[PDB]
């Protein structure tokens, strides 16, 4: 017979051989008898019972059946012990195949979360919360997620990012704090949170600079939540990204109260955000031709900032800019929310019309890599503002763009700005190199930090500390490589004559 049914027959015999002792049997016998039954329906096949029934039970969610199994197996010698073994090796096996195929990374996180739920939920009901099991679920859970080096951490982030952007689905706070806490509990399992921070940061900046978030007080808890169970320096940066936002406001108010008493002419409402170079991600400056009207504004501001804030230097980042354009069409008058790179291009069409990629790349001054997609929108995608002559999914060299005349759009204020929030493959790779080529210093700098604490230490007794201090792996290859650099530059040394002991050496 199958198992759910076999385990039922066992809880039956035990009931009968039990309700037998009460009747015609001597209360003495109950102990020997029951041990016998137990050691013939359970002992003698535990291994055999799990090996061919547990798996199926779990990935099908037979709650009741799991319980009878827990209770029963518990009564035997190493029954509860053996039930762990399988359960854990089950979690890992099914868990591994959730995170090891690059092709399935899209579903990576959600499926991890949902699994964790089934698993947890079985521990509550089916295993009565036995903590030996929580230990193993936790422990094992971290053995399989980390069989896949860096994606987990990354993805977790890109996932959180989709929870804080513009969107209706996250319409309540009670549960947003939950879906947020549920993730955080996964987080803890990952190795390479320095990768999480990496993409996390990168994704906030884009959120803080281009287009709103779910909630202000919401985006805050997240930090609060990371500060806790991770470090105050881990989040040090992000906390700063925000401050800069508060300051940029302050300043902005003053520049306006000052700009007030000037009888003003400027038709452009300019709002500027000033960021602390060390906190925020690294940004590559792009040279572009800004309309005269534009430069001026930016200059007057610069003067206002450099003055009142002596000892500083600015550097405008066009990549992150965005603006609002009023458009004069037929059957409309709409206004667009466009990136800087988009704004420029479009403007050409005021005192112009019908242009070819090349003649465009000449006059503002973008970059092929970008101008393409910056142009891929405006046309191709949704096909709505601009029209591409050699019409095609992509953009070539001749392709002419015509100022469209369509507009049936039932709106005002369109957001073409989507381009500004997509991480290209380049961005991705780059924002990963600056973490592998980052760990190196974090290792070195962390080595030195400890060496000072205790002037003399054993190698394997160090590799241990690093596993606690760093927020990542640390290949034995790389470490070896590190002590090298530090002995050569005179920060530490091998003394007492045994390559397993190290002395600081100020």
């Amino acid at each position: 017979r199958e198992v759910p049914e076999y385990l039922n027959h066992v809880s039956k015999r035990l009931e009968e051989e039990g309700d037998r002792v009460i009747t015609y049997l001597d209360h003495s016998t109950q102990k020997p008898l029951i041990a016998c039954v137990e050691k013939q329906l359970l002992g003698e096949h535990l291994t055999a019972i799990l090996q061919k029934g547990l798996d199926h039970l779990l990935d099908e969610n037979r709650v009741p059946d799991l319980a009878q199994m827990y209770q029963l197996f518990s009564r035997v010698r190493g029954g509860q012990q053996a039930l762990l073994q399988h359960w854990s090796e089950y979690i890992k096996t099914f868990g591994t195949a959730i995170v090891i195929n690059p092709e399935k990374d899209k579903d990576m996180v959600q499926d991890l979360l949902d699994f964790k739920d089934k698993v947890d939920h079985v521990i509550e009901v089916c295993f009565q919360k036995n903590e030996r099991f929580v230990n193993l679920m936790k422990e094992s859970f971290e053995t399989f997620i980390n069989k896949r080096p860096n994606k987990p951490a990354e993805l977790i982030a890109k996932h959180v990012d989709s929870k804080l952007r513009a969107g209706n689905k996250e319409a309540t706070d009670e549960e947003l704090e939950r879906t947020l806490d549920k993730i955080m509990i996964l987080f803890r399992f990952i190795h390479g949170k320095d990768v999480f921070e990496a993409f996390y940061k990168k994704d906030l900046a884009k959120r803080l600079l281009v287009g709103k978030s779910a909630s202000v007080d919401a985006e805050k808890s997240m930090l609060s939540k990371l500060k806790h169970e991770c470090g105050a320096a881990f989040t040090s940066k992000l906390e700063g990204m925000f401050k800069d936002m508060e300051l940029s406001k302050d300043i902005m108010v003053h520049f306006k109260q000052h700009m007030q008493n000037q009888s003003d002419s400027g038709p452009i409402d300019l709002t500027v955000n000033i960021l602390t170079m060390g906190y925020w991600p690294t940004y590559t400056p792009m040279e572009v031709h800004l309309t005269p009207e534009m430069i001026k504004l930016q200059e007057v501001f610069k003067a206002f900032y450099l003055g009142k804030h002596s000892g500083r230097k600015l550097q405008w980042q066009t990549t992150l800019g965005h603006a609002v354009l009023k458009a004069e069409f037929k059957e409309g008058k709409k206004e667009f929310q466009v990136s800087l790179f988009q704004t420029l291009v479009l403007l050409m069409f005021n005192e112009g019309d019908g242009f070819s990629f090349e003649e465009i790349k000449m006059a503002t001054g973008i970059e092929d890599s970008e101008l393409r997609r910056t142009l891929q929108s405006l046309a191709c995608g949704k096909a709505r503002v601009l029209i591409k002559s050699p019409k095609g999914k992509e953009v070539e060299d001749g392709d002419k763009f015509i100022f469209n005349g369509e507009f049936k759009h039932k709106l005002f204020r369109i957001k073409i700005n989507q381009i500004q929030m997509k991480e290209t493959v380049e961005e991705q790779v780059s924002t990963t190199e600056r973490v592998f080529q980052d760990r190196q210093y974090q290792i070195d700098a962390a080595i030195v930090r400890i060496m000072k604490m205790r002037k003399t230490l054993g190698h394997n007794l160090l590799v241990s500390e690093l596993y606690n201090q760093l927020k990542f792996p640390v290949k034995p290859g790389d470490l070896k490589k590190r002590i090298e650099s530090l002995i050569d530059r005179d920060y530490m040394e091998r003394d007492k004559d045994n390559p397993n002991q190290y002395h600081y050496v100020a």
């Binding site: 320096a233 300019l270 060390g278 230097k313 609002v324 004069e328 070195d444 920060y491």
Partner: protein, 90 residues
């Protein structure tokens, strides 16, 4: 008349301390040019690992000319804000 002006215009800019000719400031060569320790082949040939480190105080320096300035003291040698290290990379 125009088929497209500009109503709002959000701009972004990053600030950094203006430090005369952006010098390594501890070795005062250049923020991005070997260093001293590196620039001269003494007993240290690790010029490959020579980049900028920024502190919380926000002035940057070569990871090298600075990791040194830490054994002895421990405070952004231009700031007073005790160093702490938030970013590697030019």
């Amino acid at each position: 008349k125009k088929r497209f002006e500009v109503k709002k215009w959000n701009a972004v800019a990053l600030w950094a301390w203006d430090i005369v000719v952006d010098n390594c400031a501890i070795c005062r060569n250049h923020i991005m040019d070997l260093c001293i320790e590196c620039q001269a082949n003494q007993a240290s040939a690790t010029s490959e690992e020579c980049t900028v480190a920024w502190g919380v105080c926000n002035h940057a320096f070569h990871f090298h000319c600075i990791s040194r300035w830490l054994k002895t003291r421990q405070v952004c040698p231009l700031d007073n804000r005790e160093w702490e290290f938030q970013k590697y990379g030019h």
